[PDB]
Amino acid sequence: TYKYVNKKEVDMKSATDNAARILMWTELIRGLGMTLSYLFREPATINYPFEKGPLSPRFRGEHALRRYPSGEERCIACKLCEAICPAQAITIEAEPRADGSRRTTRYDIDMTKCIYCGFCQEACPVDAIVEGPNFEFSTETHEELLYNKEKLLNNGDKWEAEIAANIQADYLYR
């Protein structure tokens, strides 16, 4: 089904109507009315520091590594978070901890390399690496953006309460 967007007598009434449109700029005045109208509408802006634009639970934001309630870090170095990262951001090398368990000696997410796809959130079997809510982690130096296991684990501890609430809200969906 198609439609003609712009597909198209001369009477004094008509012409006089058209001439007035050109002479007294009638349509131009119409446009001014629209903007005057909004001037009276409430502005939609938010005080940025005081009020924050709403983000729902799936917002990917900043990477964090979670820990079991007991205190044992969740990651068991299966290293498929490294395998599915599209940007090659996550670098993981591991060795058996004295406990005999399997843990990552080095876990480095290069956030400048990361494109925040959220697949790592997806891929982890123990769900140790999660996309944390925080989006405000702008840093003065490039090195700060590169993150080792200690920063991510620390990021995980700081935001664990909200991360747990967010995963709680969205796990049925996944």
Partner 1 sequence: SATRVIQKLRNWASGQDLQAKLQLRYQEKKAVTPAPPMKRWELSKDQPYL
Partner 2 sequence: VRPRSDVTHKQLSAFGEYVAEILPKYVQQVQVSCLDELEICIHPDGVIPTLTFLRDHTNAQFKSLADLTAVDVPTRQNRFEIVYNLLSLRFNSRIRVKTYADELTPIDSIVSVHIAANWYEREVWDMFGVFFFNHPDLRRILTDYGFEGHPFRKDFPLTGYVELRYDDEVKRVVAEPVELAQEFRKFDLNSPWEAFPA
Partner 3 sequence: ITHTGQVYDEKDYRRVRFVDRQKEVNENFAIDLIAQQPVNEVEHRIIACDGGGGALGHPKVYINLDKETKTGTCGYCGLQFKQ
Ligand X SMILES: CCCCCCCCCCCCCCCCCC(=O)OC[C@H](COP(=O)(O)OCCN)OC(=O)CCCCCCCCCCCCCCCCC
> Which CB atom, from 124 or from 163, has the smaller least distance to ligand SF4?
124
Site for partner 2 in 43-102 (CB under 8 A): 82-83, 88, 91
Q: In this structure, how many other beta carbons lie within 10 angstroms of the beta carbon of residue 164?
A: 13
Residue 34 as a binder of partner 3 (CB under 8 A): the answer is no
From the list ligand SF4, ligand X, partner 1, none, pick the one residue 75 interacts with, judged by a Cβ distance below 5 to 8 Å according to partner type.
ligand SF4
- Known binding residues are 75, 78, 81, 85, 114, 117, 120, 124
Binding of ligand PC1 at residue 26 (CB under 6 A)?
A: yes
The answer to whether the beta carbons of residues 147 and 63 sit under 8 Å apart is yes
Return the amino acid letter for 52.
Answer: K
- Quote the least distance from Cβ 21 to ligand X, whole Å: 7
Residue from 111, 129, 152, 153 touching ligand SF4 (CB under 6 A): that is 129
Query: For residue 90, how many other CB atoms are within 10 A of its CB?
Result: 23
Chain centre to alpha carbon of residue 107: 23
Among 23, 44, 98, 161, binds partner 1 (CB under 8 A): 44
Number of residues located near partner 3, criterion CB under 8 A: 32
Query: Restricting to residues 28-57, which ones interact with ligand PC1 according to CB under 6 A?
Result: 29-30, 32-33, 36
According to the binding rule CB under 6 A, does residue 75 interact with ligand SF4? Answer: yes
Residue 45 vs 70, nearer CB to partner 1: 45
Cα–Cα distance for residue pair 110/143, rounded to 1 Å: 9
Query: How far apart are alpha carbons 155 and 150 in whole angstroms?
Result: 8
- Nearest alpha-carbon partner for 64 in 149, 139, 137: 149
- Spatial contact of 134 and 82, defined as CB atoms under 8 Å apart: no
